[PDB]
Every structure is written in structure tokens, then in C-alpha cells.
Amino acid sequence: STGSATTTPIDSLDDAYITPVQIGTPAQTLNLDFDTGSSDLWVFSSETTASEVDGQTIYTPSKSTTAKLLSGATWSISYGDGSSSSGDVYTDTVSVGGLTVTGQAVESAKKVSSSFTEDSTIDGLLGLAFSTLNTVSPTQQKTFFDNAKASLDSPVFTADLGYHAPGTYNFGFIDTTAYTGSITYTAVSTKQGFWEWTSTGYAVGSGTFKSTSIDGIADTGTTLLYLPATVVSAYWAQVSGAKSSSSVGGYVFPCSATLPSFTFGVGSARIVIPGDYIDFGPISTGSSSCFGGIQSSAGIGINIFGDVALKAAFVVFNGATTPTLGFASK
Ligand SMILES: CN(C)c1cccc(C(=O)NN)c1
Numbered sequence: 001s002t003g004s005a006t007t008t009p010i011d012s013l014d015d016a017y018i019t020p021v022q023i024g025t026p027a028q029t030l031n032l033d034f035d036t037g038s039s040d041l042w043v044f045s046s047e048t049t050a051s052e053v054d055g056q057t058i059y060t061p062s063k064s065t066t067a068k069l070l071s072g073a074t075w076s077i078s079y080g081d082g083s084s085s086s087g088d089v090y091t092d093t094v095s096v097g098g099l100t101v102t103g104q105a106v107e108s109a110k111k112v113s114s115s116f117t118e119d120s121t122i123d124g125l126l127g128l129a130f131s132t133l134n135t136v137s138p139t140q141q142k143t144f145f146d147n148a149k150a151s152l153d154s155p156v157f158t159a160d161l162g163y164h165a166p167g168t169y170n171f172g173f174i175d176t177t178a179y180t181g182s183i184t185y186t187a188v189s190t191k192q193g194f195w196e197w198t199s200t201g202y203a204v205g206s207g208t209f210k211s212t213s214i215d216g217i218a219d220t221g222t223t224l225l226y227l228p229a230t231v232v233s234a235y236w237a238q239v240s241g242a243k244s245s246s247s248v249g250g251y252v253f254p255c256s257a258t259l260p261s262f263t264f265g266v267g268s269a270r271i272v273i274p275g276d277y278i279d280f281g282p283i284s285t286g287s288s289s290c291f292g293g294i295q296s297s298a299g300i301g302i303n304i305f306g307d308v309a310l311k312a313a314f315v316v317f318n319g320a321t322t323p324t325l326g327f328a329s330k
Contacts, residue, residue, distance in 0.1 A: 001099055001100075001148070001151045001152055001153065001172055002098070002099060002152065002153055002170070002171060002172035002173045003095075003096045003097035003098045003099025003148075003170070003171040003172065004097040004098065004168060004169075004170045004171070005019050005020065005021075005096050005097030005168070005169050006019070006020075006097075006166050006167070006168055007019040007034065007159075007161065007162075007166065007167050007168060007169050008166045009162065009164065009165070009166075010119070010121040010122065011121070012164070012281075013280055013281055014161075014162075014163065014164060014223070014307060014311065015223050016033050016122065016221070016223065016307070017033065017034070017161060017167070017220070017307070018031035018032065018033060018121060018122060018123075019031065019032055019033075019034050019096070019126070019169055020032075021094060021095070021096050021126060022093075022094065022095040022096075023043065023059055023064070023092055023093070023094050023106055024059065024061070024063070024064030024065075024066060024067055024092050024093060025064055025065045025066040025092075025093060026064075027095070028057075028059055028060065028063070028064065029057070030043055030044070030057050030058075030059060030123035030124055031057065031121065031122065031123045032122070032123060032124050032125060032126040033122050033124070033125045033126070033221060034125075034126050034128055034159075034169055034220055034221075035125050035126065035127050035128060035129070035219070035220055035221030036128045036129055036159070036195055036217075036218055036219055036220040036221065036317065037080070037129055037194060037195075037217060037219035037220070037221045037222060037304075038077065038079065038125060038127040038129055038133060038221060039127040039128075039129045039130060039131055039132070039133035039134040039135075039143050039193065040075060040077050040107050040125065040127045040133075040134055040135055040136070041094070041104065041105065041106060041107060041124070041125065041126045041127060041143065041144055042075065042077070042085055042087070042106075042107035042108070042109055042124050042125055043058070043059040043106060043107070043108060043109065043123060043124035044056040044057070044058045044059065044109055044112070044116075044123050044124055045058050045059045045060065045061070045087070045108040045109055046058055046059070046060040046061070046062065046108075047087060047088070047108050047109065047110050048087075048108075048109045048110060048111070048112060049110065049111055049112075052111065052112050052116075052117045053117065054117050054118070054120055055120030056120055056122070056123045057123045058123070059106065059108065059123075059124075061090045061092065061106075061108065064092055066092050066093045066102075067090045067091070067092045067106075068090060068091050068092070069088070069089075069090055070088075070089040070090060070091055070105065070136075070139075070141075072138065073088060073089035073105075073136050073137070073138070073139060073141075074086070074087070074088055074089070074136070074137055075087060075088075075089060075107045075135045075136045075137065076135055077135045079221075080222065080300065080304075081115070082113075082115075083113045083114075083115040083116060084112075084113045085109045085111060085112040085113065085116060086109070086110060086111050087107060087108045087109040087110035087111065088107075088108055088110065089105055089106070089107050089108065089136055089141070090105075090106045090108055091103045091104060091105055091106065092104060092106045094106065094144060096126075096144065096169070096171065097169070097170075097171065099148055099151075099152075099171050099172065101144055101147045101148050103147070104144055104147055105134075105136060105141035105142070107136065107141075109124070125221070126144055127143050127144075128143060128144070128145050128157065128220070128317065129143070129193055129194050129195065130143075130146075130190050130193045130194070131143050131146045132190070132193045133193035133194075145157055145171070145317075145319060146319075148171060148172075149319055151172075152171060152172035153172045153173055154172055154173060154174070155172075155318070155319045155320050156171075156172065156173070156174065156316055156317060156318050156319060156320075157169060157170060157171045157172075157316075157317050157319070158170045158174060158175070158178075158314065158315060158316050158317065159220055159310060159314075159315045159317065160175075160178050160179075160314050160315070160330065161220070161307055161310055161311035162311060163274075163276075163277055163311050163312075167311070174316060178314050178330065179313075179314035179328035179329065179330045180328065180329050180330055181328060181329055182269075182328065183314070183316055183326040183327065183328040184266045184267045184268070184269035184326065184327055184328070185267075185316070185318070185324045185325065185326040186198070186266050186267055186324065186325050186326070186327070187324060188318075188323045188324050188325050190323060192217075192302075194217040194218075194219070194302075195217055195218040195219075195317060195323070195325055196215065196216070196217050197215075197216070197217075197218065197325050198213050198214065198215045198216075199213070199214040199215075199216065199264050199265050199266065199305075200212075200213065200265030200266065200267060200268070201213075201214070201264070201265040202214070202227075202231055202262065202263060202264050202265065203262070203263040203270075204234055204235050204238050204260055204261075204262060204263075205238055205260030205261055205262075205275075206260075207238075209263065209265065209270070211265075214227065214228065214231070214264075214303055215303060216297075216302065216303030216304055216305050217302060217303070217304055217305065218305050218310060218315060218317070218325055219304050219305065219306050219310075220306075220307060220310060221306075222304045222306030222307065223280075223293075223306055223307050223308070224280070224293050224294070224295050224304075224306050224307070224308050225262070225273070225278075225293060225294045225295070225304070225305060225306055225308040225309045226295050226296065226297035226300055226302075226303055226304040226306065227294065227295075227296070227297055227303050228296070228297060228298070228303065229296045229297075229298045232251065232294055232295060232296045235260070235262055235294050236251050236253065236292065236294070238260050239253045239254075239257050239259060239260070240254070240257065241253060241254040241257065242254075242257070242292070244296075248283050248289070248291070250291065250292060250295045250296070251291075251292035251294070251295060251296075252283055252289045252290060252291055252292060253289070253290055253292055254288065254289070254290070255281075255282060255287075255288045255289065255290040256288070257290075258275065259275030259276065259278045259279055260275050261273060261274050261275050262275075262278065262294060264305075264309060266327040269327065271309070271312050271313045271327055271329060272312065272329070273308060273309060273312040274312070277293060277308055277311065277312060278292060278293035278294055278308060279292075279293065280292065280293050293308045294308065312329075313327045313328060313329065313330065314327070314328040314329075314330045315327055316328075
């Protein structure tokens, strides 16, 4: 089997992407944030505290003839941005882009933190990291990908995120029309439960490539590119007036600037992030100070190849017995 679903930016800045997902019988379609940096499929639901729901579409398990309470199971998760959610668990039928999994754990939120409530466009998350990170207790549950894998034509999914435009998540096949040149594959460590890999270095604008190992994670659920302070300083030093602002919470730059590109290495290959991808707009409405899309990972403990980086590439998440990651230009 295979599946193919379009993923759409939630706003003009590409802060996140939503992908429609069918849950239950008859189908209830919710727009989920596909997150390669976590491993829980959770949804706003009929069980979510009413004051914490503001415009989201909810899953109502009592209206699904295939929903079954997973007795005794609870979940609770907190993300890198400080947000969180928790609740209980059903199994139900879940389909993405024509690919169907029966008996998928659908984690029903009883509580969500304010940032979830405040974002009406995201109805929940669909985790695509390794199932070892799944938070369901006392019996850990498998991701949608993990459940689907054996049925897939090839044990892979791909992320093709758009810049200010829709893109695609495919399951079970590599669309050879969706990228240019060849796909360069690189080793993955699953030790921390992430799609963790080592970039071979970077360049700023038309500058020379610096060969240096940068360990980080491919994380579709993180907006920005978070890299070591040395690398980030080298980037922003090429932008007149750019500075790190502790009050704002990162590098800012004059909105009048034209940003340089940023290149990262994948083996001997190179992925170029155009300068415009690194512009996250005014820090507050009407400001002439703009927020940068490349930020330091120093306060995080891990480097994160988030959407800013990933949307410059066609990315293969290879879930074969020894997982790997592939990157192509597009
Ligand atoms: C340390 N934490 C929780 C962490 C680290 C790195 C990534 C994430 C995540 O949720 N990504 N979508 C979370």
C-alpha cells in the first residue's frame, strides 16, 4: 500500500503545516501537525476541557463505530516549546492520503496548554519519530508509520514541505518526479528516539563551505533551524544590523535587509536554503525588526533541522531495519 496527502502551511510565515487525517467510522477529518520530532498521535476531542477548545475540530469517539477505549491507558507530553497536552486513549481506524491503519492509538486530549488552544488551525499532532518516545502508559503505543510499515510497498515516508505553499507527505513510495538530481542518504541514530543525523558542514551565502560535523534531528514539528552558536553568529554577521536580542528571544534583523542563503551538507551533497526562507517577519505587528529563521541551539541541548531547513529539500525518512535519512534538492 501507499498514501499521499497534501500538507498546507497554517499561516503566511509557514509556522507549521497541517495535513488532513481521517479518524473513525464514519470518518472524522481533523487537520493534524505531522511531527517527525515526536511519537504521539493526539487530538482535540469531545473530552477536551471546554474552555481549552477555541475553533479546533474535535474527534468524538462516541460517534465512531470502530472506536474502542484502551482501558487504563493515559498519556502526557510536553514539547520543546514548553507546550503540553494529556488525556486518555482510544484505538480506531486512521487514514492518511488513502493509507489506512486499523487499531491505531488515538490519544484523546483532556487538557491542552494555552498555545494549543490559541491556535485554531491545528486539531492535534501525528508523531513520526520512533515509537520508543511514545508517552502512553502503562503500555506504550506505536506510531501511525510503525503500524503501517509492514503493509507499505517500501518502509519509508517522505516530507516535501513548501515555502509559502502546499507540499506533500507520501507513505510507502518515493516520488521520483518530486526532486532534482539524486537523493543522498546519511546515517541515523535512533538512540534518543529521533531522526538524528550528522550534517557535514555549512556555508553562508556565496561563502566557502566549512567542513564540520553537526549532529541534529530532522524535525518537521519545529519551525526554525537551530544550530550551534558559532554557526549562527557566522550567518547573522553577514546581515547589516542583525543582533541577538535577549528581550525578543533570538536573532533579529532589519526588515529592510536582503538575507543571504544558508547551505548545509549531507555527505558530499549540499542543500541550499534561500535567504527568503530565513525571514520570519516583524517581531510584532508593524515593527521594522524582523525575526530570524536561523537561531542558536545553545539553550536546547540539541541541534534541530526544522521546517526552515527541511522545506528546502525532498526528505526521505527510511524506516528500514537500519533507518537512514535521504535529502535531495528540488
Ligand atoms: C526536549 N524536547 C522535549 C524536545 C526536543 C527536540 C524536539 C522536540 C519536539 O517535540 N519536536 N517536534 C522536543
